[PDB]
Amino acid sequence: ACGYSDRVLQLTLGNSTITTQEAANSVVAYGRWPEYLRDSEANPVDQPTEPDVAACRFYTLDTVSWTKESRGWWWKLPDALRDMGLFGQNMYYHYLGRSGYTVHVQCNASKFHQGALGVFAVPEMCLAGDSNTTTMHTSYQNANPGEKGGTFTGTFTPDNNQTSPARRFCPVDYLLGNGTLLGNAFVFPHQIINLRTNNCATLVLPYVNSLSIDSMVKHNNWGIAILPLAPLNFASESSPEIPITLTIAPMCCEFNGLRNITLPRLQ
Amino acid sequence: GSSSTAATSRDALPNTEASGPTHSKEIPALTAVETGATNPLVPSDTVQTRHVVQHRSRSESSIESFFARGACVTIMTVDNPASTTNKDKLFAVWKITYKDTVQLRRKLEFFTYSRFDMELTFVVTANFTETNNGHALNQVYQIMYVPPGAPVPEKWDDYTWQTSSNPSIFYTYGTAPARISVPYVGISNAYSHFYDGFSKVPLKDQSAALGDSLYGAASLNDFGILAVRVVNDHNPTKVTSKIRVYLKPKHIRVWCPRPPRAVAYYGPGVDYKDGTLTPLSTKDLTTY
Amino acid sequence: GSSSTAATSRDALPNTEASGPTHSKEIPALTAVETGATNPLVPSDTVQTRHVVQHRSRSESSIESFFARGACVTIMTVDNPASTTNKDKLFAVWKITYKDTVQLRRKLEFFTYSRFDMELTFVVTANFTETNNGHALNQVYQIMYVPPGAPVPEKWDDYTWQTSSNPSIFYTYGTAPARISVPYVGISNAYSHFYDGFSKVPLKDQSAALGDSLYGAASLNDFGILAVRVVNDHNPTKVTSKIRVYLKPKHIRVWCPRPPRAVAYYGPGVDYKDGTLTPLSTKDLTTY
Amino acid sequence: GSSSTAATSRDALPNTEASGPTHSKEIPALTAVETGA
Amino acid sequence: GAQVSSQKVGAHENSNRAYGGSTINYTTINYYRDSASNAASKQDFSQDPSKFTEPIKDVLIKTAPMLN
Amino acid sequence: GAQVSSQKVGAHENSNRAYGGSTINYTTINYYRDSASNAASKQDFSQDPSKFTEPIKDVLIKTAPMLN
Amino acid sequence: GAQVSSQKVGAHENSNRAYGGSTINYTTINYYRDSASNAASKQDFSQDPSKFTEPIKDVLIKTAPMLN
Amino acid sequence: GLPVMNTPGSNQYLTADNFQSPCALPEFDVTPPIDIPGEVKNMMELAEIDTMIPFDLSATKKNTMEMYRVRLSDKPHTDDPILCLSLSPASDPRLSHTMLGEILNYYTHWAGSLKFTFLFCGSMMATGKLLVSYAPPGADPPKKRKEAMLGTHVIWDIGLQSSCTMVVPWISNTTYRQTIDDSFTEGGYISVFYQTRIVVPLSTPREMDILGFVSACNDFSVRLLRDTTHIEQKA
Amino acid sequence: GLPVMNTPGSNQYLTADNFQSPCALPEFDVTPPIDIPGEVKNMMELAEIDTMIPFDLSATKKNTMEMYRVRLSDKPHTDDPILCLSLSPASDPRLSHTMLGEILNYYTHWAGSLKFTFLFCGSMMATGKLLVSYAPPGADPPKKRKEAMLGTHVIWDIGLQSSCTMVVPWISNTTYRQTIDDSFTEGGYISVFYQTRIVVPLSTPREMDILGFVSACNDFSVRLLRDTTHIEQKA
Amino acid sequence: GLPVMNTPGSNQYLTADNFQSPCALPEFDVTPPIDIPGEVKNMMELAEIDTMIPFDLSATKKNTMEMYRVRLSDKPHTDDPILCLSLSPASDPRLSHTMLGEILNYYTHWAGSLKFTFLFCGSMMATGKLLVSYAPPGADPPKKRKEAMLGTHVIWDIGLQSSCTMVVPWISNTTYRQTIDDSFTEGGYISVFYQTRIVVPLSTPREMDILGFVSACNDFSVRLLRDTTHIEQKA
């Protein structure tokens, strides 16, 4: 009647707005919109900080590039937003924090391009390490890349330097980087950016954890995994490239246990 | 006095309704999986169907029924040697976990989080080892739960076996397997099958060694140990025994489904090992 | 609270009525068996009778009562040898069936189809075999049901005995015989005692080998296997054991009566063997 | 026949009440342990 | 949730203020959720044998000629 | 303090004056103060799979185009 | 002479037509004349700690000066 | 715990017991019944069905189709028997493998009335009268029509109703008989005689067969379940 | 004490039993639940979620991301198959490791309707019509469109609705099928064919992939819990 | 006897069980209670009583009366700590042997708010302001007033009310913490600093002690009973 459509959306949070004209509806993970911590589930007793529009707004991370050789990308939350404006400051000044998110993945191309990205949001996205001599050895620094994220690989390559081990993840793409088959990742909240259909993915994520609130600096609640289910192609070019951009807004974030700021060892 | 007993697990699934030919703008068959949704079709959406009164139910695949079984989670070895042995009498210490074996672990790991009461059942077997004709009298075993912080036994007969506060089971050989229940004892609101994090934040102002910890590990799952001994004094003929521990998660709830483990387990985390990463076998695309 | 309790199995049969002399066109005695019917006569139709209050009943020949007995359907052998043996520790694997023995099989085969809950009882016996004086401690046995598709154990101690999902019974030697019940588990609406067909249609366009299958066989009756082991570790004196399995069909219904097996059974089908085809003995026509 | 069943051992402890900023002569924080309390 | 039923008494003891006469009942309580676990009640029904003894389309009257 | 519940009967014996028909119940009495000691009742609930199969913000009408 | 009491349920099974919800009770019957033979009921009382934490003769008002 | 005291019988396994036991497949989704034709509720229903008697167990006819055929002919009247059989339904070799006999061999005791029906299989042009007899036990077994005629009997006239039934009324000293050959519970004698003779016109077969069938009446019952000697498994 | 008598089953440990047992931590102060998003009540809820099929298990594509991609091209019409798969959801190698297949490998029996949804991942400028087919068992498995077209099928027109679902209606002789390869409970044949051909304009990729997904319908159930062959622990 | 079937657990002795058992002294004439002052109903009542902290466990002060005395002096203002303690009430050596700590060592888990009260024991003529701080975990432990002042804290003015209480509010990720040193359930940092400085007039001691006390609040609880490492019996 007025022409409203699944494909055309506007999202506004704080001082930020996203528009899209080629959406494929949007997902609310497990049917649960983000929410503040109810009194009946509360646990730290101090009055929480709730930054509201100062932190619940769209932050855009560094753009990456999709090519025919890309195996996939991953980020962790809250880690990818640790250095984002007042969200990052509130996270590091407090022992505890909780937050939900709107995740908007952006990737446009043309009616002559093809390819499809699976965009998965995974609760507790534990990834496999690079070692066959020690388990659970990925270091804090390598497990937490911040906004640059990390990547998947098509080949497991064990680290053989036992003198100074690399201590990083070696996440194999068809094993979802965690020992399970990628074809089943669709039981996690997801969308697919299939270039002939849509140019974005939107996932609204509730805070998920076995606790009401926890250490954001120690623990990532959600992982975002983006993998090419169908490879990028274009006209008859051998090396096409198109960018992928992530923009994420915290939602209903609240924090407890205020003290001096955490200054983490990140390199 | 007497209590007597909304979709339940044992209810019949929906009937198939009869449906006829169709020609219209309704398009159930066409869909768009990019949205993240699965198309909710039933056969009458794409073929002609008859009426069928459905009697099958999903009673055996409720979470409770999928998990209603004791699974072996460990084998503990103990013995009772002669007093003249150079070797110490063996008592066993086991850090409680479902990750030392693989079958129950894989089933629980279809989910991210769970809550349950735990039933533990203990099967105890014994045998002679030296080709001798000497004999032994019926053994009694002490299975002591030593929760984190309590003194772990260092000798089969030290003071810790007094158990004034730890719970202990004294099991008599040859009787029905021992059994206890434990409540949901997690320090969280649910057990975490996966913890994407660390127990320590490494600080810039501190040495790397001081801020280091294992990926994916936390006391979320430190439940302490079981310590087991043969209570009988040393005997001239050595007897060795095994205690098999079976875990059944009862009164269970689970959250956030996951793809199941597809390559062999490799330690208590999600790590995998080179040479085990090829679960699928060969099959040609156009071969039935 | 308390529930308290149309021809029933224990009702008295019909009384005999008194009947006198007769002279008429009524002809009960004459009949024609070509029709396929049996003549429904009682004694007062062809002789003079007195009145008799009948008290006998058919209570013990109801289907339930005819079958209300455990029957041996197999004997499984297992052992627990020294660790120094060249021979592997014997665990047993038995494909579940009532056709390895003959008595229950013949009774069920008075019918074409049946439905029942199954009660299985297990009698376990053991003995020494080497004329030695060495001893053994009381054994525990694991009886694991491995349904079709589940991994069958290849060694007495491999991972399959974890039983996270298969049901297992751990039986302790010297205690009351083990016992479980199973529901009607058939993939059909009744168990088929006879299946006149094949599991494969041979196709013209395919090799004969590819379309071949055994006559009278189908997964209608593939119920999987029982796998049994002595759980105790190897002992210096070898002990051998036998598990006898008894099947009682309870809560039973049956359909389509058949002539009973009259010559010796010969395999799991209806085949017979040369030299066994003469069940009747000699008797002269005019000799009482 | 059948019998069927004031702070008990299994009762929940007291709730935390919300409380805001304060500026007054009320002095909960100051005390004197000499009293024995 | 007890089921009380009566026994069909065969040999009766010399007693009618306790055994033989004043209907002797017995009690059953099921202990398991699965009905396959239940004992057999043996309270069974009989039926007319006609589907095997007289499966003819037109009713048999025994005093009459079977063929007419 | 008995709990009486009904069984879902699968194979029915030839009986309706004792087994198969007139609803067969079973009885449970808890013997322990701790509920962790209880057996499982198995009287469990089902739910709609939609939070996993249809987690989209705007309702799916299957006869309609998913994208519009 | 049964005592029926309620359990405080911690983990609840997916059930409210048998377990988790509709108050789960348990039953106790004493078998012995001597009460020393009884099990512990664990239905115990709490009290205010004041006889140890505030044994002062004149009432403590925490917002007030303790010494005045 | 509740004070209890174990009685005799404790821990035994009686194969005829009837107790509850735990289910190895809890909450299994059982397939429902469908209404299959031919349900049976009691083994005596099968005993009431006529099945054919192997009357002639001579060395050359036994274990062949010929054992079921009783040969008659148009020979001159004789008072000598066509057949002689003992009323021992589970143990006389001619009755023990009929459906009635094979069910009685799973029980120790039998009681009630029985019936024998004979079918004439000669040509339509053949006529005749036969005498079918049951003599309750205790006297010389009938070998001549003169004696057989004094017991229970039916004189059968052969004709358009092809068959004839003689009822063997339950006549017994004991309330049940044994399902083995036993004198105390012996049942007596069944025999068939020519009453007149078989007569045929010319161009007609002068020899022909009759077939006999046995079934239980509605007052028939069995008891004390037992194994049969009719099947075995050697080694 | 109360006179009692032990029955068979006494002292056994059946791992599927369901009894009460004493608590080792009486009066423990249990932490209450919170409302965690994503609770599951039945394993069949997971089976109703679409997961992606590893269709191409060739020696070089199996165990790589390429196993999920079915390659199509704009080649001239052929009646030869794009793919062929057996309806054995727990044991055909292409279906057994999907979420549906991996749950079915913890059960012995399955029943109900299934559905296959295909996603076209070519460019927007590419068009085409494909035929998706299910042939219930018992005849020559379809290797030509002519035969596949005679069974259950959907003709998919590629276009703005990117995907197409074919429902495999429960059509079976038994009330449940086995979760292993078995002829008696075989399920039939799934295949995909070109109906017209893929057509693209110039400056467009002439080859592209489709992805397929499988999920259970709301009439689907499983029973008889069992261990899976999909995990093991050697020594 | 009543048919019964023994389950697993039969004949075991669980030391935490709670069953009836026969009395060895039936009809004993028990002496009645009298109302003795000081009855206790719950161990947490004892945890709510202030007991004194052994803050200074230096090699020469530990295990002497001096371990309880925290020495202050009228030295010029510094931002450096008077004392530093970890909030690990059952395992930090300064807290684990207080009444609260010794009760927590019979349990595995603790939860709730705590409070620290300090008593000034200098002369009446001495004045001063101190800052008492609690910093929840996860950052550099405070070693300067600048950092400590950013967490929970009380600025204590010394005067006629001799003592001052800082409440350590329950601020925790888990619903209960472990009663051992553990990073995942770490509790944070307690510290005391000079806010201004201690000032005294002439003829007055320039050094003096403060004493500190710890007790649980009314929201404090413990669970999972366990043996303590604080007592042993060697051989």
Ligand SMILES: CCCCCCCCCCCCCCCC(=O)O
């Ligand atoms: C005398 C026997 C005492 C038995 C003590 C049981 C102690 C608690 C064990 C908790 C088991 C936890 C299983 C889930 C673990 C996880 O979080 O991954």
Ligand SMILES: CCCCCCCCCCCCCCCC(=O)O
């Ligand atoms: C731990 C013990 C488990 C026992 C498992 C019993 C498995 C089902 C057996 C079905 C028996 C079928 C008998 C009739 C067979 C037929 O169809 O001919």
Ligand SMILES: *C(=O)CCCCCCCCCCCCC
């Ligand atoms: C009906 O069941 C209520 C009457 C209860 C009578 C006593 C029950 C005897 C013990 C049964 C225990 C529960 C069995 C699992």
Ligand SMILES: *C(=O)CCCCCCCCCCCCC
């Ligand atoms: C409800 O519980 C009252 C009905 C009591 C029926 C008989 C109880 C059977 C024995 C239970 C003993 C107590 C168990 C600790």
Ligand SMILES: *C(=O)CCCCCCCCCCCCC
């Ligand atoms: C109250 O006690 C009356 C209800 C009785 C219920 C059944 C009792 C169960 C057996 C107790 C036996 C006596 C113990 C010495």
